[PDB]
Design a protein around this ligand. Structure first.
Ligand SMILES: Cc1cc2nc3c(=O)[nH]c(=O)nc-3n(C[C@H](O)[C@H](O)[C@H](O)COP(=O)(O)O)c2cc1C
Ligand SMILES: Cc1cc2nc3c(=O)[nH]c(=O)nc-3n(C[C@H](O)[C@H](O)[C@H](O)COP(=O)(O)O)c2cc1C
Lengths: 105, 106
């Protein structure tokens, strides 16, 4: 099953909700990730150019997909097929971001 | 600010998360709505045809936008500009639904 991460739209996009599969994949419990930016999933071998593409997409509230090297709580690397989409209201205000996380290792 | 409702994809789409604006708009605290289908927001003056359109869209996991009459916890009616989108993984599995709620009574 694919994980899901929901963040606030502003500040530094703190996590406000994760589903069960997020914990299955990453080894982190909800309580230890809520209020944090999801970048804690990154590590030494994470590709900087990929991170920059995510950074730009989020800044512009544009949908993006990347295959990015992430790390479980225990430090084991995994390949994360990550898809991020903005959540907008009818007036175009960005309410939140939703990320889908699939372990494609 | 617009409210947000996140539900599971299956088994009559129980609410798994709401943002603070949801509480401001509807008068319900998270604890009062988690694990329930959002249809408790509806009431007697809610348009049945609108509800039917939502029902069919959600069953097919299709995005839908409707203006629907809803009710706060205390029974006060309000017009809800509601936008629902499925969340899918790249294999096409529906992971969740996300609803945006805007009070457009005024
Ligand atoms: C909803 C959402 C989910 C995210 N999920 C992940 C993730 O699973 N793995 C990851 O490495 N980054 C993820 N990110 C990206 C980071 O949070 C961050 O935006 C990215 O590293 C670029 O910003 P930075 O250069 O400040 O790190 C997610 C971002 C958002 C908004
Ligand atoms: C994510 C999500 C959010 C929803 N938000 C609302 C809402 O704010 N107001 C509402 O009247 N119905 C809302 N619904 C629709 C009801 O939960 C339900 O799907 C609809 O009433 C049709 O089913 P029914 O005929 O069994 O009631 C939402 C559904 C989903 C999946």
């Amino acid at each position: 099953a694919s994980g899901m991460i929901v963040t606030d739209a502003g500040a530094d996009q703190p996590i406000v909700f994760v589903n069960r599969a997020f914990s299955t994949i990453t080894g982190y419990a909800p309580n230890e990730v809520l209020g944090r930016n999801a970048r804690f999933l990154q590590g030494p071998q994470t590709d900087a150019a990929t991170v920059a593409r995510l950074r730009e997409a989020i800044a512009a509230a544009r949908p993006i997909q990347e295959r990015i090297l992430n790390y479980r709580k225990d430090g084991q690397p995994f390949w994360n097929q990550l898809s991020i989409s903005p959540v907008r209201d009818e007036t175009g205000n960005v309410v939140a971001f939703v990320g889908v996380v699939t372990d494609v290792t």
